Amino acid sequence: SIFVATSFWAALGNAGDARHGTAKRLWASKPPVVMTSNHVLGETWTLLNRRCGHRAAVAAAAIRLSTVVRVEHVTADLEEQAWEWLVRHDEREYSFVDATSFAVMRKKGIQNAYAFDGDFSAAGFVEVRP
Amino acid sequence: SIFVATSFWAALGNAGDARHGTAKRLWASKPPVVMTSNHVLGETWTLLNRRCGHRAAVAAAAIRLSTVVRVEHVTADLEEQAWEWLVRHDEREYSFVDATSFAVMRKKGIQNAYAFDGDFSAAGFVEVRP
């Protein structure tokens, strides 16, 4: 299984992203179980909206309708763990969505992330490469 | 009676923000009932962590512990309402967090927002000023 982060969705959903081709390659080779979070989709919307405008962002909104991609609603319990995690890990700059993403992966026993730019790698997960 | 957006927290939590002065004055004259959301606090963490560093971002994390600020966990239902709203409103660039913020306010019957930049005003709310 894999967990998909915003950095990946943003690449996949933006044809003008420098890592678009890499993303599509990764997407074609993905395992059957693909999950992400409500926080990630929201972040993806915002990023794609700011970068490519409303139409491109609508694509991200539609992922929540997918029968193939599993979207975890991050619970209050999981968020509390993410907050605690965030407060202790001052060694590197981590976003809130990243911390909730790590928390989801730990909960679901997921080690592989579809993500770029090394934050998941730094946090002890595997950022899948083509 | 008021909902506090990310833009306000970011100004209040960063003394170098151009609207920090306005934020503190509004914060001094705020009503007894003050509300925000998990999404907003998460976004605030991320912004402050990038701009001012870990120690400053921890302040935002601590708001979730407040006995005076009500922190609403945005339900999957409210997010769905936010998603449908986002898809509908192409006339202006709206973030996901702001969309969920609008949804929370509408459900709670709140129109007065502690927020800057006019996005809440555009969405039909009152961005309160001193």
| Residue A37: its H or E element | strand A34-37
Q: For the sheet with A126-127, list strands across it.
A: A69-72, A34-37, A2-4, A112-114, A126-127
3 state SS of B86: helix
Backbone angles phi, psi at B126, to 5 degrees: -105, 110
3 state SS of A14: coil
State the Cα–Cα distance between residues B16 and A69, nearest whole angstrom: 42
Q: Which of B120, B122, B96 is nearest to B110 (CA)?
A: B120
3 state SS of B115: coil
Where does chain A have alpha helices with state H? 6-12, 20-28, 38-52, 54-62, 76-88, 96-108, 119-122
Q: CB A54 to CB B79 under 8 A?
A: no
Q: Kindly state whether A46 is in contact with chain B, defined as any CB-CB distance less than 8 angstroms.
A: yes
Write out chain A residues lying below 8 Å of B64, CB-based: 80, 83
Q: Which residue of B lies nearest to A61 if distances are taken between CA atoms?
A: B83
List, as own/partner pairs, every contact residues A87-94 make where C-beta atoms lie below 8 angstroms and the sequence separation is at least 24, other chains included.
A87/B58, A87/B61, A90/B54, A90/B55, A92/A119, A92/A122, A93/B49, A93/B50, A93/B54, A94/A119, A94/A123, A94/B49
Q: Kindly state whether B58 is in contact with chain A, defined as any CB-CB distance less than 8 angstroms.
A: yes
Q: Kindly state whether A83 is in contact with chain B, defined as any CB-CB distance less than 8 angstroms.
A: yes
CA torsion, ordered A4, A54, B86, B41, to nearest 10 deg: 60
Q: Which of B33, B22, B41, B48 is nearest to B127 (CA)?
A: B22
Q: Which residue of B lies nearest to A97 if distances are taken between CA atoms?
A: B42
Q: CB A38 to CB B86 under 8 A?
A: no
Q: Where are the domains of chain A?
A: 1-130
Q: Kindly state whether B8 is in contact with chain A, defined as any CB-CB distance less than 8 angstroms.
A: no
Method underlying the structure: X-ray
CA torsion, ordered A10, A8, A105, B71, to nearest 10 deg: -10
Structure's resolution in angstroms: 1.8
3 state SS of B35: strand
Q: CB–CB of B72/B36 below 8 Å?
A: yes
List, as own/partner pairs, every contact residues B118-121 make where C-beta atoms lie below 8 angstroms and the sequence separation is at least 24, other chains included.
B119/B7, B119/B92, B119/B94, B119/B95, B120/B5
Residue A54 Cα, gap to closest chain B Cα (Å) = 6
Where does chain B have alpha helices with state H? 6-12, 20-28, 38-51, 54-62, 76-88, 96-108, 119-122
Residue A76 Cα, gap to closest chain B Cα (Å) = 7
Q: CB B87 to CB A43 under 8 A?
A: no
